[PDB]
Amino acid sequence: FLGLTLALSKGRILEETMPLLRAAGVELLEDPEASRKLIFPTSNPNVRVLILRASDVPTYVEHGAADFGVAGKDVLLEHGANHVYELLDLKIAQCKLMTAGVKDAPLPNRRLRIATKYVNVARAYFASQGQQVDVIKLYGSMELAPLVGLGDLIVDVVDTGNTLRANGLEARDHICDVSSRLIVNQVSYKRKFALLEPILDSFKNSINS
Amino acid sequence: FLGLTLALSKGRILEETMPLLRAAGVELLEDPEASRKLIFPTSNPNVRVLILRASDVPTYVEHGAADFGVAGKDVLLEHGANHVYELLDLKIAQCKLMTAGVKDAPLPNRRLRIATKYVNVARAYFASQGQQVDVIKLYGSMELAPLVGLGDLIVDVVDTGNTLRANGLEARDHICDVSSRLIVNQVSYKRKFALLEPILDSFKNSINS
Ligand SMILES: O=P(O)(O)OC[C@H]1O[C@H](OP(=O)(O)OP(=O)(O)O)[C@H](O)[C@@H]1O
Ligand SMILES: O=P(O)(O)OC[C@H]1O[C@H](OP(=O)(O)OP(=O)(O)O)[C@H](O)[C@@H]1O
Structure with a gap:
């Protein structure tokens, strides 16, 4: 897969991320909560979504199995964030x-x-x-x-x-205090910046309002 | 609580343990799957049930927060079983x-x-x-x-x-091969044997058929 793989978790992170994604032009094509499937296409053919246990989001992003992800600060602190970049405080799932x-x-x-x-x-x-x-x-x-x-x-x-x-x-x-954060793989940040950048800019704009 | 506290997990372990418990004179008074409550009385006033994550069963039993429990061999191997007694292979959740x-x-x-x-x-x-x-x-x-x-x-x-x-x-x-095993706290085994013994004997009899 040439595009971006986004790591999310079920429940509040999925629910509260979807509006940011929508405003960034990314929409899921079905409800992951109602599927046993783990990889999901989106309305953007360059973006796919992995649904993970919250504790595994940093792991997949660190290894590059996902290029970026949305993880709770609690999980980041516990796992250690030294091998990903924390780019945004999304102010969701507080x-x-x-x-x-x-x-x-x-x-x-x-x-x-x-x-x-x-x-x-x-x-x-x-x-x-x-x-x-x-x-x-x-x-x-x-x-x-x-x-x-x-x-x-x-x-x-x-x-x-x-x-x-x-x-x-x-x-x-x-x-x-804990909120969900946007984390990025250190290599994906460098190699796939042109794909990440408009999505990051959209999220950042969205979080301001 | 003076009696026995039994550690179980949701899903197949709860479902497949209940018949052993029934034959041993212990029945839950409601469905734990449908409650957010974690401690459950039983038909026997000397026995209560904790519903735990499968990975936490050995931990609660080891520390004596439960006197005994039903844990998968997979979980026991991973956690380490050196500080509990594995008494029975229940032959459930295979x-x-x-x-x-x-x-x-x-x-x-x-x-x-x-x-x-x-x-x-x-x-x-x-x-x-x-x-x-x-x-x-x-x-x-x-x-x-x-x-x-x-x-x-x-x-x-x-x-x-x-x-x-x-x-x-x-x-x-x-x-x-993995099956659920009956584990006991090393001190409870010694101090509460008269409570454990008829339940263990019932389980052992039940497993034979
Ligand atoms: O303070 P409260 O509003 O009661 O929420 C606290 C709960 O939230 C967390 O669970 P998580 O959100 O991961 O899932 P859950 O809420 O479905 O347990 C945590 O493990 C607590 O159980
Ligand atoms: O070989 P299968 O019959 O497909 O079952 C294998 C699944 O069982 C285990 O999950 P667990 O039983 O803990 O819960 P789940 O089956 O609801 O995932 C394991 O994590 C696998 O996902």
Whole structure:
């Protein structure tokens, strides 16, 4: 495939990216949410879309299996963004990385154990608080961990806070704001700039309003 | 909670475990597939169920956040089973760990790159073939990886083989057979044996027929 391959993920990233794509002249020809297919043509024959797990977007873009992609800052921080270029903050799929635990549970006076998917972000954040923590790696449902006593806190993304509230948890610390970012393969940026440029300019214009 | 906490995962593990549980006198009181809730009472007041991501079952059981659980051999091999006891092969959710690639694609004469979730299993398998491979860690949709040239092969579970066939891929090597296994926390095994024992005996009896 000679053109550009764009990496997206299902849910909020797909939904909130599509209007940027539309204004940039790119529209999907069916709903990826309703297909098991993974590669999708678009209204532009030079652009195709990969639908990936959010955690795999940086990986595909880094290796050049996608030329560019839309990834959450949370995923970028966790994966490491040293081998892609972060070109734009798209200001979509906004949320916060936070620490949380059982409401009014006292913290134990010992090395804390942090149940989380975000092991690198947990370690770096807690290091900034003077804290060398243990991490317990999980793949999902962080909110259960404090209810069964797995770790002392979690680190997870919080949007409305409804998940935390539904489970008797409250945010302890705000780590950072998260939004989806446009990332580009370091070589594709150089080799396919004439294809990327009008799309980047459109996105940038769109984000201003 | 004084009783036993059982870790399960959604889909085939939940579906195929429920009959064993029923024969052991444990029935869920609603369908976990239709709830966002994670802890579930059962017909037995001494048994509750956690619904977890399959990859987190060994973790919860290891730490004692669950006393026992049902995990796929694939997950156990990848996570490491050195800090739980594998008590039974339940013979449910049967599948195979396999290597696969694009159909009739020749392997490149260099260090292979293996796109997979199963990074430890990929490295150990290929080591047995005299091969020190690079791994590219992914979280899902392994079948896409060879279609976009991310890695040379994948390692993933194969059941019917329909996923591979739908994507123009074929299995190259059979790594091992996979089935769901009953695992127990090493301390719970010792402290809660009188609760576990009749349930284990029931499962063992059930698996014989
Ligand atoms: O603060 P809230 O508005 O309750 O949202 C927080 C949830 O969002 C994230 O999940 P993600 O968005 O990846 O998928 P989900 O919302 O479908 O769980 C995260 O894992 C929390 O479960
Ligand atoms: O050989 P097949 O019968 O096509 O099945 C193989 C699929 O099964 C596994 O997924 P899992 O069972 O975890 O969930 P899924 O089947 O819903 O993808 C694996 O990740 C493959 O995608």
